[PDB]
């Protein structure tokens, strides 16, 4: 029984092995603990928004939406319909980015590196969409607790449509490389099997549930924004292993394309942030012409808006699973407490059970199928 | 509604079993993957010829910071400290006093570029469009010290980039 | 794409798909980088009359949570937190992959 400390995303893993078998796997984390939750207590809500971009870096837009939903619930306001549609469209784009990252990396670690490049070209195109809508490629801060910061430029919808009508062929090429390959199946089939009861008790969420046959998806069960106005299917696994989760993720990307199509065709007119200048800042022209607009701009950018006292737990169906925020407001313009719930935390806590009686090389596959991003896990 | 990803049962007739045996022995799907790679070899690559060719950008893109001025040549900044107040990283340091002619102007305006997160909150909090995030992104440095911008550096950046900055603002200001 | 016909045929046969219909390189089909100005309409609160803020004040309608069963101060049918969730339907678009 030999003990190996595979040290330095960045992960330290202490294992005891009996021969080739993995007897015990112990992850040591905190190599990316930056104390986000303590730092948030020294910021206004607007000032605290950009930390959520950095929490789960792979899918920045979704974290913005979760934080904005929590703050909106505490504020007792609702965003305008066009803002909600933009939020859902960019959340599905965000899902595609996360899925491409998760699938390609899983394949790359497994030793297949070709689809990483093939799909990172598409990732670059989606980064272009991000940059055109917000000015930043990845750390966007676009989705705000009153709606969105800016309206779409006049040619963005057409370019998104042009991109999205060619992506299914890219997914088909990825599948041609992966799904029926016997080496890929031997690397993934019957690896990291988790039962439904164990997945529920261990706090798993997202695909980590749906690969075991659990029919659960927050966008269907507890819809937020306009997800109740779009039609899509929830892919469900049957064996609870890595292969079924890969299929579910691939299927999810196709579903995301479907939802993006619906969002494009049903984008409504109107304003992009709530018409309430005590929450959302006014327009520049109004700020430079009206006394009330200038006062509200000054106060919203110096003190910030006050949130009525209370605590909420708001969760959304993130690309990596259920992503949640427990937000406690004391009545001032700075949050009293912000606890961030990350799906990867519970998934990595379950890695020990998932890797019981497997090869050392199976641990890499299980880590890849758990979809672990370190920034969210450590916070 | 929901979908099954892996709920297919293989056929057990002799023809299907022989097809699967032929796949097992003659390596058919591996040849399919080889064909996919071969097809990808013969298409045009997506590489651009940097630095002679550049990636696409938007008027909304946020780059190196700059301090702008009015067409008369007087600076726009009136030392309200709204950008300093809103800065999520506390990267802005401002000190101000009345000028020799009584104007409300800054004597110190520093941005720690190694603390900045390039969020652009300062340029949207500014009431007079004084601090902006200009289009330049190629300003890497050999030392940490040259990334601690004072007021002179930011005014020089503004005078250097004003043409492009004003064009970008003209393009994007109707969205703000 | 500036590709010869023979190379197009070879890549089409190798992949098994028609590449020309769905190319991964952008061309003139994308939008112009110079666009006309927008107009960006205003929201529902931009009225000149009948627009008192007290009638559209979301933050001031928030209240402290309702208290049921403070400890310090009949058939009785049993209840559940919410009604049992209905089972899902099997996607009559492509039920099986």
């Amino acid at each position: 029984n030999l003990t190996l400390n595979f040290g330095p995303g960045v992960l330290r893993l202490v294992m005891e092995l009996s021969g080739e078998m993995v007897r015990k796997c112990d992850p040591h984390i905190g190599l990316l603990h930056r104390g986000t939750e303590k730092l948030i207590e020294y910021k206004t809500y607007l000032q605290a928004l950009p930390y959520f971009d950095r929490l789960d870096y792979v899918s920045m837009m979704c974290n913005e939406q979760a934080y904005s939903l929590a703050v909106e619930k505490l504020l007792n306001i609702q965003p305008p319909p066009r803002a909600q549609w933009i939020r859902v469209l960019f959340g599905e784009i965000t899902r595609l980015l996360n899925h491409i990252m998760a699938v390609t990396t899983h394949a790359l670690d497994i030793g297949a590196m070709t689809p990483f490049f093939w799909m990172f070209e598409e990732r670059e195109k989606m980064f272009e969409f991000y940059e055109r809508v917000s000015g930043a490629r990845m750390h966007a801060a676009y989705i705000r607790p009153g709606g969105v910061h800016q309206d779409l430029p006049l040619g963005l919808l057409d370019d998104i449509y042009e991109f999205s009508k060619n992506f299914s062929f890219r997914i088909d090429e990825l599948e041609e490389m992966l799904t029926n390959n016997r080496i890929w199946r031997n690397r993934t089939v019957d690896i990291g099997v988790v039962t439904a009861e164990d997945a529920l008790n261990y706090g798993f969420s997202g695909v980590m549930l749906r690969g075991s046959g659990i029919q659960w998806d927050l966008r269907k069960t507890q819809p937020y924004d306009v997800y109740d106005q779009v039609e899509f299917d929830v892919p469900i696994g049957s064996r609870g292993d890595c292969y079924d989760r890969y299929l579910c993720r691939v299927e999810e990307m196709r579903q995301s394309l479907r939802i993006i199509s619906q969002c494009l065709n049903k984008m409504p007119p109107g304003e992009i942030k709530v018409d309430d200048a005590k929450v959302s800042p006014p327009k520049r022209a109004e700020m430079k012409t009206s006394m009330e607009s200038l006062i509200h701009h000054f106060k919203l950018y110096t003190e910030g808006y006050q949130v009525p006292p209370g605590a909420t737990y708001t969760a959304i169906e993130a690309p990596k699973g259920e992503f949640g925020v427990y937000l406690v407001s004391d009545g001032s313009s700075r949050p009293y407490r912000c606890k961030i719930k990350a799906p990867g935390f519970a998934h990595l806590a379950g890695l020990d059970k998932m890797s019981k009686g497997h090869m050392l090389a199976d641990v890499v596959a299980i880590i890849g199928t758990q979809d672990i991003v370190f920034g969210e896990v450590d916070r | 509604t929901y979908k099954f990803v892996n709920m297919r049962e293989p056929s057990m007739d002799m023809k299907s079993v022989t097809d699967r045996a032929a796949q097992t022995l003659l390596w058919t799907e591996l040849v399919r993957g080889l064909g996919m790679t071969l097809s990808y070899l013969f298409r045009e690559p997506a590489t651009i010829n940097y630095p002679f060719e550049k990636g696409p950008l938007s008027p909304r893109f946020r780059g190196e910071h700059a301090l702008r001025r009015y067409p008369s040549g007087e600076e726009r900044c009136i030392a309200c400290k709204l950008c300093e107040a809103v800065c999520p990283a506390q990267a802005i340091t401002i000190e101000a006093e009345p000028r020799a002619d009584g104007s409300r102007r800054t004597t110190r305006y520093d941005i720690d570029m190694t603390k900045c997160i390039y969020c652009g909150f300062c340029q949207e909090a500014c009431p007079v469009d004084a601090i902006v995030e200009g289009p330049n992104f190629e300003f890497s440095t050999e030392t940490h010290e040259e990334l601690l911008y004072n007021k002179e550096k930011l005014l020089n950046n503004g005078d250097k980039w004003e043409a492009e900055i004003a064009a970008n603002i003209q393009a994007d200001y109707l969205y703000r | 794409a500036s590709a010869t016909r023979v190379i197009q045929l070879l890549r089409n046969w190798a992949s098994g798909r028609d590449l020309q219909a769905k190319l991964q390189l952008r061309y003139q089909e994308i939008s112009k980088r110079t666009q006309p100005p927008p107009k960006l309409p205003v929201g529902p609160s931009h009225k000149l009359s009948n627009n008192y803020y007290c009638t559209r004040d979301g933050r001031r309608e928030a209240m402290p949570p309702s208290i049921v069963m403070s400890s310090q101060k009949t058939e009785k049918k049993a209840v559940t937190p919410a009604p049992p969730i209905k089972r899902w339907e099997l996607s009559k678009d492509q039920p099986y992959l």
């Binding site: 919808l157 | - | 927008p38 309409p41 992959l97």
Partner: peptide
């Protein structure tokens, strides 16, 4: 005077977008 102009889908909507898996069988017994 001038009417509203923002980014909207074209009249009649956009064309259909493929999303189903396409893995054709080349064909050989």
């Amino acid at each position: 005077a001038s009417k509203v102009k923002q980014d909207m889908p074209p009249p009649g909507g956009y064309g259909p977008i493929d999303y189903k898996r396409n893995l054709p069988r080349r064909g050989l017994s």
